[PDB]
Amino acid sequence: REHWATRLGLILAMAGNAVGLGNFLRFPVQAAENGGGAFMIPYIIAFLLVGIPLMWIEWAMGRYGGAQGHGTTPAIFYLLWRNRFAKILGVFGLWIPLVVAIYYVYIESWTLGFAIKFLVGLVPEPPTDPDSILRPFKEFLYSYIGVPKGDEPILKPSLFAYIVFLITMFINVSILIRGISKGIERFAKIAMPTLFILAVFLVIRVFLLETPNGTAADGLNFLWTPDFEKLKDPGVWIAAVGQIFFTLSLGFGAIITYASYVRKDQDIVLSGLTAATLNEKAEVILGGSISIPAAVAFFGVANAVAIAKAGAFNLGFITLPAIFSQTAGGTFLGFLWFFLLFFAGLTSSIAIMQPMIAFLEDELKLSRKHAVLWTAAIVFFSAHLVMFLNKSLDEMDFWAGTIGVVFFGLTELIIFFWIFGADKAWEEINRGGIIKVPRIYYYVMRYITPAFLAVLLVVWAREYIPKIMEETHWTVWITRFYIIGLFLFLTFLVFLAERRRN
């Protein structure tokens, strides 16, 4: 089996996995919609009672399976528990990262294209009216991704966006095709530091933004000022948990696949804790100090929150660059922004394609080259659905990136810490650890976490089950049908592997 060359490279690879578009896009929006500081408390708690324990659990499962030559959940779930249903459940550790990868890489290609156009200096040029400043950039994005005037099911992506998507796929492939240590680690050791530097620079520059309508400091205060009136709102807790899952790459089967390349005897405790901590630092300190403080700086708090609620991409791809355009050398600043976004995305996309690649390699005994090329073919092909179909992206992000990750987290936790046994699991987690997990967490993993997740899933299901059946748009039904087809396909591949074993 292939392994990580150094501990540092491992750390930066995992941190590259975690730190991504979720930090500089999803987080600012989630926090803004949820009332700033009010969202932070539930966010921190969710980080302690969910993110950390699940992170460690996934590292442990990953390394455990990797020792036996299995980096994916279909096989690992079977090693921990002997059942066919364990494999069927394991299929999600593939389906989820694949589905997410499909649209995620497309958004990444967005960030790349924008980076290019901002570098070359082709951008809308604004003239004191907010709408006259934002409108050009809204039209810019809409022209880029081909957004319809009314609500029209069909999207018309520009040739440039398509070509840039092809290029993005090519880059992902060039990185992934060199392997774990040569391809991923090498790139992590660069992209990560570059990312941190860019992030810091942007944070400072943004902090320097002050106008008659407000300041970045106002945004920081808004974000870090506690509000206890929202603690009784379940939605805030749900959003916080979802954010924790998404940002830490929990339930995507990615952490597990990466961990399977960690040598049996190497420490996953301190490495894992370090990766998670790095991610949180990149999220709350960096991600949260850029977009929101700037939006609040120019348009004030209320308007900033309004824009945040407006959409996820509205803050990142429209508002922020429109704010930059009003400052000296704002175009270049935008470029830095989208470049940061690009690296942050790439480091994650490679991570979510790696599970599929690893299933192909380990289970179907395919060569790395073939596995990578086929994964890229599948992802690229399926991506046309997200490209040309409006609302498809949202559906995939929902079923996979939202519900699926929580369901799968609960599943893996139950399989590892209950069926496989709690004591054996604990011993497996602590084994070889440079430092040991605090005893209390044993009780957190076995009782608190699974209960919390179960409750969450119950609430979610209660709310969504009625809504699902009544939905007007056909695009979502097409997407659902297709992704279900992907699930069946993966199940079939798992079947083939199982047969090959015999």
Ligand X SMILES: C[N+](C)(C)CCOP(=O)(O)O
User: Between helices 449-469 and 405-414, what is the axis angle to 10°?
Assistant: 140
- Name the residue type at position 480: R
Instruction: Please give the residue whose beta carbon sits closest to ligand MET in the complex.
Output: 22
Closest separation in Å from C-beta 85 to ligand X: 5
Among 9, 20, 219, 401, binds Na ion (CB under 5 A): 20
Cβ–Cβ under 8 Å, residues 39 and 236: yes
Spatial contact of 259 and 58, defined as CB atoms under 8 Å apart:
yes
Supply the minimum distance, in Å, between the C-beta of residue 488 and ligand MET: 23
Q: Which stretch binds Na ion (CB under 5 A): 17-25, 131-139, 390-398, 435-443?
A: 17-25
Q: Quick one: what does residue 104 bind among ligand X, ligand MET, Na ion, none, with the CB cut-off 5 to 8 Å set by partner type?
A: ligand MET
Out of Na ion, ligand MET, ligand X, none, what residue 254 binds, judged by CB under 5 to 8 A for its kind, is ligand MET
| 242 contacts ligand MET (rule: CB under 6 A) | no
Q: Which of 215, 348, 411, 449 binds Na ion (CB under 5 A)?
A: 348
CB neighbours of 417 closer than 8 A, spacing ≥ 6?
57, 425, 445, 446, 450
| Residues in region 8-67 near ligand X by CB under 6 A | none
In contact, 41 and 226? CB cutoff 8 Å: yes
In order of 105, 278, 389, 393, the CA distances from 470 in angstroms are 30, 42, 19, 19
84 marked among binding-site residues: yes
Residue in this structure with the two tokens 């060569």, named with its chain if needed: 367
Calpha distance 76→116 (Å, rounded): 42
CB of 499 to ligand X, least distance (A): 13
- What number of chain residues touch ligand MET (CB under 6 A)? 15
Smallest separation (angstroms) from Na ion to the CB of 347: 3
Pick the closest to residue 62 from 428, 501, 444, 451 (CA basis).
428
Beta carbons of 401 and 246 less than 8 angstroms apart:
yes
Of 18, 80, 294, 483, the one binding Na ion by CB under 5 A: 18
Give the separation between CA 477 and CA 83, rounded to whole angstroms: 32
Residue 100 or 259 with smaller CB distance to ligand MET: 100
**Residue 210 forms beta bridges with which residues?**
215
Q: Is 4 left (phi over 0), alpha (psi -120 to 50) or beta?
A: beta
| Position 55 contacts ligand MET (CB under 6 A) | no
Question: Distance (Å, rounded) from C-alpha 497 to C-alpha 502?
Answer: 9
In contact, 406 and 456? CB cutoff 8 Å: yes
Query: Quick count: other Cβ atoms within 10 Å of Cβ 18?
Result: 27
The binder of ligand MET chosen from 34, 72, 73, 249 (CB under 6 A): 249
Asked if 291 interacts with ligand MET (CB under 6 A), we say no
- Return the residues of window 68-87 that contact ligand X according to CB under 6 A: 83-85
Q: Are 223 and 29 in contact (CB under 8 A)?
A: no
Of positions 16, 22, 71, 251, contacts ligand MET by CB under 6 A: 22
**If binding is defined by CB under 6 A, does position 98 make contact with ligand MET?**
no
- Enclosing H/E stretch for 401: none
Our CB check for ligand X shows the closer of 74 and 293 to be 74
Q: Are 61 and 76 in contact (CB under 8 A)?
A: yes
Select the binding partner of residue 85 from Na ion, ligand X, ligand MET, none (C-beta < 5 to 8 A, by kind): ligand X
Applying CB under 6 A, the span of 57-65, 77-85, 347-355, 377-385 interacting with ligand MET comes to 347-355
Nearest to ligand X of 44, 414 (CB atom): 414
Side chain identity at residue 203, one-letter code: V
Identity of the residue, 247 or 331, whose beta carbon is nearer to Na ion in the bound complex: 247
Which positions make up the binding site for phosphocholine?
84
Which positions make up the binding site?
84
Which residues contact Na ion (rule: CB under 5 A)? 16, 18-20, 22-23, 247, 279, 344, 347-348
Which residues contact ligand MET (rule: CB under 6 A)? 18, 20-23, 100, 104, 246-247, 249, 252, 254, 348, 351-352
